[PDB]
């Protein structure tokens, strides 16, 4: 049952399986555009960073999910959990509620202090309109589906994180007070 989940998850094979899954979607997709001659957008590229970043999180996390490393790897998993989900919303709202500013659509704005984009414009430079539909499943745009996965991934980490032995009665001090006010 649940206990087993912690067993299968605490295994590397399982972790490696999570990577191939997120990758399989990127590859199988990288082919659709290669033939469908599809072009990425500003947001699309940004969203790719949210997951692409997580993928890297699964590579380092699968190093030893039995040590405090959890907080270390989940740091990226969670970052995408709240932000990834919150962002995925902007796409949905705008998609069903188109009303942008003047011409905010001005390529990707990033500080020249991070050659991550300058030294690598290949997977950063945007080209095309954002929110446009070029391919859908069951009558749903990819962005909508991909979001479906984001939720799934958000659950495996939140559940696998809490699956930790937890318990422990010690826990000396935890959280500041400061609420006595003043006369």
UniProtKB/Swiss-Prot annotation:
Disulfide bonds join 41-44, 104-130. The keyword Transport applies. The keyword Signal does not apply. InterPro entries: DiS_bond_form_DsbB/BdbC (IPR003752), Disulphide_bond_form_DsbB (IPR022920), DsbB (IPR050183), DsbB-like_sf (IPR023380). It holds the Pfam family DsbB. It is a multi-pass membrane protein. The chain crosses the membrane at residues 15-31, 50-65, 72-89, 145-163. GO terms for cellular component: plasma membrane. Disruption phenotype: Induction of the PhoP/PhoQ two-component regulatory system. One of its GO terms (biological process) is protein folding. Residues 32-49, 90-144 are periplasmic. It comes from the Bacteria. One of its GO terms (molecular function) is oxidoreductase activity, acting on a sulfur group of donors, quinone or similar compound as acceptor. Keywords: Cell inner membrane, Cell membrane, Chaperone, Disulfide bond, Electron transport, Membrane, Oxidoreductase, Redox-active center, Transmembrane, Transmembrane helix, Transport. It is found in: Cell inner membrane. Residues 1-14, 66-71, 164-176 are cytoplasmic. PANTHER family: DISULFIDE BOND FORMATION PROTEIN B. Required for disulfide bond formation in some periplasmic proteins such as PhoA or OmpA. Acts by oxidizing the DsbA protein. PhoP-regulated transcription is redox-sensitive, being activated when the periplasm becomes more reducing (deletion of dsbA/dsbB, treatment with dithiothreitol). MgrB acts between DsbA/DsbB and PhoP/PhoQ in this pathway. HAMAP family: DsbB (MF_00286). Belongs to the DsbB family. This is Disulfide bond formation protein B. It comes from Escherichia coli (strain K12). The lineage of its organism: Bacteria, Pseudomonadati, Pseudomonadota, Gammaproteobacteria, Enterobacterales. The gene is dsbB.
């Amino acid at each position: 049952m649940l206990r087993f989940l912690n067993q299968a998850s605490q295994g590397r094979g399982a972790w490696l399986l999570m990577a191939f899954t997120a990758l399989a979607l990127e590859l199988t997709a990288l082919w659709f555009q290669h033939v469908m001659l599809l072009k990425p957008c500003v947001l699309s590229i940004y969203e790719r960073a949210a997951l692409f970043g997580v993928l890297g999180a699964a590579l380092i996390g699968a190093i030893a999910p039995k040590t405090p490393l959890r907080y270390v790897a989940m740091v990226i998993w969670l970052y995408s959990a709240f932000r990834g989900v919150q962002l995925t919303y902007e796409h949905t709202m705008l998609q069903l509620y188109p009303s942008p500013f003047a011409t905010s659509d001005f390529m990707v704005r990033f500080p020249e202090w991070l050659p991550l984009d300058k030294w690598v414009p290949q997977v950063f430079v945007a080209s095309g309109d954002c929110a446009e539909r070029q391919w859908d499943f069951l009558g749903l745009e990819m962005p909508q589906w991909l979001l479906g996965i984001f939720i799934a991934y958000l659950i495996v980490a939140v559940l696998v994180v809490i699956s930790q032995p937890f318990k422990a009665k010690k826990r000396d001090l935890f959280g500041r007070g400061h609420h006595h006010h003043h006369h």
